[PDB]
């Protein structure tokens, strides 16, 4: 196929003011553009992001090298192979084999993904179907599902300057009648939350973090949960909103125990065992509508994850545990460590591998939650992705900052286009096919 | 040339509030535009139509504006069979159909959404880029990349610090290109974050609506010194200058000005307009301050006139002028200011925005194209500032993608123009001068 006419890459700025890769692919159908969300340039289990490391330029975060790899090498090689733009698997296989390394470190995981994404968009256009339909086709899925959105509205953990140890406190409008109404509920709860924060914590307490949520200066994770409850009740949706958490416990594990005040000066006297931590989670589940907990234990604390899951009935999500990595996921499945995969496309580095990972988790009875990264762009690919993959759940920010709202707005447009055939996952978010 | 379909919807803006988006289809494809937040009440600007259902999005829905497009305005425009390239006749048609002075029959947000989508379609019909079509509509032969003005330290009425003045901006006028202006701006921003974190704490770096920081400070001199520190740490003291938006109407009190207006009332601390002017002269003498927006109250005309005559910097109307032709004519006649802030949604059509810019430039004024606090993923104003050749745009800190979307589009425009691209640089006030 001579469908692919031109491939050009550039450096643009992400939502945090750091460089990332953008790729334009041209065919007879037009120009197809995709950008890559920030990832990791080091790490043992994820695909390697290539960063320039020039400390005098963008504080070492340039992506000139990755961009050059596309313009000079990867792009020309792909165009010369004359592959169909609709054959996502063959295209991704070619790029993976040309790179030839397990972690995409020859060209950069960011270089390969940028191309992979643009090809996918062009493939949908060649077939004359929406991107969300092409993705479903690629996943062998006859149907399409609008996800429940999970909004990270109260923020703690390593990147927030409060004492609050747990990372993400999310609201999920599972009781909404449609995706459009899930956005209304989400936004109204957020607006009421801001007013509660201004009153209780001060006129200086309402600026936002990287994902659009708030970081009031609190320590108690129960106090964060009570704020969500207060905002839900203030908006008048107690019957329709549930809560999801991301603990990110690897961030506070030390010498075999867990520190829920780890942003205060070192003091092992305050550390708690994994067993006491599990008891705290059970109290959350009893006292609040907590339906999902991500990274409850450290990434290597396998026996503790396995024990915990056997005694609860909620969703337990792997992020640092699994890292969108086949070998790690296989360990988790075999050890029954968790029951939901967080899906970050840039951690694995191709559209095909991301789809494969989703389908394998689903075949083992797990849920899948599609995820943003903290460095996002105006790109909306992951909205079409979650719909075509039929997962029933996405986290892509508070309803604030347009690198977040761009995805939520796109999900609204997708539901609009589907008309009276649209299905919203609602209370079946964990598995939209459940009876 | 023919318009085939027009369809409007409600989307969420960058602060989580509804706004209007319009799709216009022609033989060339789909052309999509969204409207930034504005004002539903006011004497001098076009009226944004909000639903006012207090139970739905806290009264901020735009169902009525959207339905005005789908049910009335859209079908009326289509029936008229106008060329999508004739921006002037299209906008005239919609303005006369509405028939009010402030666009309050259909809503300024309804009219503007259609106006923007028509302009994008018309560029394609003519075989030229959007920025070139705008330059054609404005009568400009050349294209100019603007200096970006990044709002990196925030105060005034919508931050909870004591800092009375509203916006502290950095402008990389000494950059070699737009691409390098972005690199300088971003590096300064990252160094500023570190400076603020070390001085004011780990909890001091969350961001406002436009992506900037609100450290808990009182002194406007301390805001300026923070910029100086960040600029020096980044290594660009010879290439970055400073702009300010005072928004002085926010702290005008019974004929005087209160630079600690968020602290408990005490009229003994209030200062005269003359004293406030002397403070600005100190900023200009001791820091590289080159531009001040709304230095005085929106009705304090004599004080603006007197101040401008004794300073050689840029003085920008925002609340003074409100992108309103009658207000702008008064400011021209009185020599109140010498630069227009251009908010397309305050006037409500592309044609009137272009006319306002041209009238300002014909009077020797500069023009700075501006975002709104509630923005979207739309990048129209990037193409707009390049076609209008104004040399200057303020559209956010280099943080939050409703801001970066515009900055990234300006880098793409520069890339498309190649080695012929002209960057305003040190001629930002008037790119045609010298
Ligand atoms: Mg996580
Ligand atoms: Mg202003």
UniProtKB/Swiss-Prot annotation, chain B:
Keywords: Acetylation, Cytoplasm, Disease variant, Glycogen storage disease, Glycolysis, Lyase, Magnesium, Metal-binding, Phosphoprotein. One of its GO terms (molecular function) is magnesium ion binding. The alpha/alpha homodimer is expressed in embryo and in most adult tissues. The alpha/beta heterodimer and the beta/beta homodimer are found in striated muscle, and the alpha/gamma heterodimer and the gamma/gamma homodimer in neurons. Its cofactor is Mg(2+). The modification Phosphoserine is found at residues 83, 157, 176, 263. It catalyses: (2R)-2-phosphoglycerate = phosphoenolpyruvate + H2O. It is found in: Cytoplasm. The modification N-acetylalanine is found at residue 2. The keyword Metal-binding applies. CDD domains: enolase (cd03313). Substrate binds at residues 158, 167, 293, 318, 370-373, 394. One of its GO terms (biological process) is glycolytic process. GO terms for cellular component: cytosol; extracellular exosome; extracellular space; membrane; phosphopyruvate hydratase complex; plasma membrane. The keyword Iron does not apply. Mg(2+) binds at residues 245, 293, 318. Signal peptide: none annotated. NCBIfam families: eno (TIGR01060). PANTHER family: BETA-ENOLASE (PTHR11902:SF5), ENOLASE (PTHR11902). Belongs to the enolase family. HAMAP family: Enolase (MF_00318). It is linked to Glycogen storage disease 13: A metabolic disorder that results in exercise-induced myalgias, generalized muscle weakness and fatigability. It is characterized by increased serum creatine kinase and decreased enolase 3 activity. Dramatically reduced protein levels with focal sarcoplasmic accumulation of glycogen-beta particles are detected on ultrastructural analysis. Mammalian enolase is composed of 3 isozyme subunits, alpha, beta and gamma, which can form homodimers or heterodimers which are cell-type and development-specific. Interacts with PNKD. This is Beta-enolase. It comes from Homo sapiens (Human). The gene is ENO3.
